[PDB]
């Protein structure tokens, strides 16, 4: 065994607190220290602190002293991480490591935004002459919350010529685009649909790409 198993993803409102957990299995949880690491696209990896299941001695990174709080429980074989007075800034993937074995990470998202179903818009080329041997069509999913969204074209039959793009963020609401490239003999004769699903708000929408009139 190597194992370290982390708590589940958390979606939290600003000013609250979360307590992450990191379960150790297959070794004697007491003989090695657990370290908590922060991952942000903007900042790479950052060390928060570490705890000794054995001696109970905590070390904190000066940046995180006062935000983070490590603790342990010897019977459960788990190390905890209470992050406090959260702000946008704490949104990231948090890990638990022993230096040799890492947990899987637990994602935290701190936001004020309520559930918001997307707005799907179809993106057809411009009216006149723009038809070479292939045409590219589009689809715009704007304004959702929170993150996961399923986007498919003609529910699976189209996969070759698809490009969906990592959702950006625009005022705390997500925005996503997807493109599709087909032959001239395909559209607009046969129909091309933009399938969009957002479980959270329970939206399932097919939006056809009609030619511009």
């Amino acid at each position: 065994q190597d194992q370290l198993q982390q708590s589940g993803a958390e979606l939290v409102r600003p000013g609250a607190s979360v307590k992450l957990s990191c379960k150790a299995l297959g070794y004697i949880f007491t003989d090695y220290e657990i370290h908590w690491v922060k991952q942000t696209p903007v900042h790479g990896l950052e060390w928060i602190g570490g705890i000794h299941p054995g001696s109970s001695g905590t070390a904190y990174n000066q940046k995180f002293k006062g935000k983070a709080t490590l603790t342990a429980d010897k019977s459960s074989t788990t190390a905890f991480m209470e992050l406090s007075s959260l702000t946008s800034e704490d949104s990231a993937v948090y890990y638990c490591t022993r230096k040799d074995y890492w947990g899987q990470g637990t994602l935290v998202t701190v936001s004020a935004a309520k559930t918001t179903a997307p707005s799907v818009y179809p993106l057809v080329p411009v009216c006149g002459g723009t038809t070479g041997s292939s045409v590219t069509l589009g689809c715009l999913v704007k304004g959702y919350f929170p993150e996961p969204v399923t986007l498919t074209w003609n529910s699976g039959s189209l996969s070759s010529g698809v490009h969906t793009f990592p959702a950006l963020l625009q005022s705390g609401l997500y925005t996503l685009s997807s493109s599709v490239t087909v032959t001239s003999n395909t559209w607009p004769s046969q129909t091309i649909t933009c399938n969009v699903a957002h479980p959270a708000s329970s939206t399932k929408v097919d939006k056809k790409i009609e030619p511009r009139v």
């Binding site: 990174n61 411009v126 006149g128």
Partner: protein, 214 residues
């Protein structure tokens, strides 16, 4: 505080050759270095511990080296499962600190993008917003220029890009550019162009449209 500097930040290699990464700390760290790998939605996995020692289930193509301040990881034969991001960790003194990362990407022949521009949709214009979208699909390498022009002038505020990682079907990259305006702002001007520069051609690649067809 103790600094780790990694090099290069990214490379272009083709499966089967020898790559070599580097970390260099700001002070001697007396071989307390781990080298780990991070892959698309995975668990960072340690390959090398204490500068040159392997790890439980790791191939021998990986090989740690160096001492003092300069440490260098080797891969004699880049396998396809080796693609991802390599980091280095110093754990001599607190606080523990890491390198920036090194992204290994598949090499390939040059490929110019196929650009497409898209006027907003009518449904969106009814709400108040107007998003103009440019797609820059299947190009290599990753380095690209996208400028937006409203009636011949460059616009910078309100532009927002999203990239995809390497396509594992052609090893290209794709780009989505969106310029978002009010419907009010949008309707004050007429011509909208999306202009891309890239290694493949000295002249930029232009796609535009007039707001009332002409």
């Amino acid at each position: 505080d103790i600094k780790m500097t990694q090099s290069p930040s990214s490379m272009y290699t083709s499966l089967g050759e020898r790559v070599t990464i580097t970390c260099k700390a700001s002070q001697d760290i007396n071989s307390f270095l781990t080298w780990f790998l991070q892959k698309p939605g995975k668990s960072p996995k340690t390959l090398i511990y204490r500068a040159n020692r392997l790890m439980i289930g790791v191939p021998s193509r990986f090989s740690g080296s160096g001492s003092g301040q300069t440490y260098s990881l080797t891969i004699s034969s880049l396998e396809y499962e080796d693609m991802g991001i390599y980091y280095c960790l110093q754990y001599d003194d607190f606080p523990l600190t890491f390198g920036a990362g090194t992204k290994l990407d598949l090499k390939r022949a040059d490929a110019a993008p196929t650009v497409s521009i898209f006027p907003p949709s009518s449904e969106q214009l009814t709400s108040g917003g107007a998003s103009v979208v440019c797609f820059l699909n299947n190009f290599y390498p990753k380095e690209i220029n996208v400028k937006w022009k409203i009636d011949g002038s460059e616009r910078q505020n309100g532009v927002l890009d999203s990239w995809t990682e390497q396509d594992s079907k052609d090893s290209t990259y794709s780009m989505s550019s969106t310029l978002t305006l009010t419907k009010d702002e949008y309707e004050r001007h007429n011509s909208y162009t999306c202009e891309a520069t890239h290694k493949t051609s000295t002249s930029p690649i232009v796609k535009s449209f007039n707001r009332n067809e002409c």
